[PDB]
């Protein structure tokens, strides 16, 4: 409903196709936060699974 760009478009198409499926991703504003922190000169990394 907010940032998730891929999610919103995919969700819209799902809604038009009936299936009320959630296809969520990551809020773009979060991405931006990290970038803002790195521009600060703090290394903030995601350690993945």
């Amino acid at each position: 409903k907010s940032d998730d760009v891929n999610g919103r478009t995919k969700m819209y198409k799902n809604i038009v196709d009936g299936n009320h499926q959630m296809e969520p991703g990551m809020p773009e504003s979060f991405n931006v936060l990290l970038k803002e922190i790195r521009s600060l000169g703090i290394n903030i990394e995601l350690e993945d699974e």
């Binding site: 009936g18 299936n19 009320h20 499926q21």
Partner: protein
Amino acid sequence: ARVTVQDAVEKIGNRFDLVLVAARRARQMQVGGKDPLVPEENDKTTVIALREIEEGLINNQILDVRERQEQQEQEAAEL
């Protein structure tokens, strides 16, 4: 089911798991086009699922049973 969900919650118990169970069932009806047990009486999928649970037709464990039954027969067909 529609107005009050109390008896449906009394069947399953955990409200949150009732949500999950009815949603997984409603998703089946929505996507798979899986047949409803109770007469729709012109009602939406979610309402159907909640009625079914109230009357004690759907269950997390029962859903798991039909999943394996049918998937296993599909594997048998493959081989």
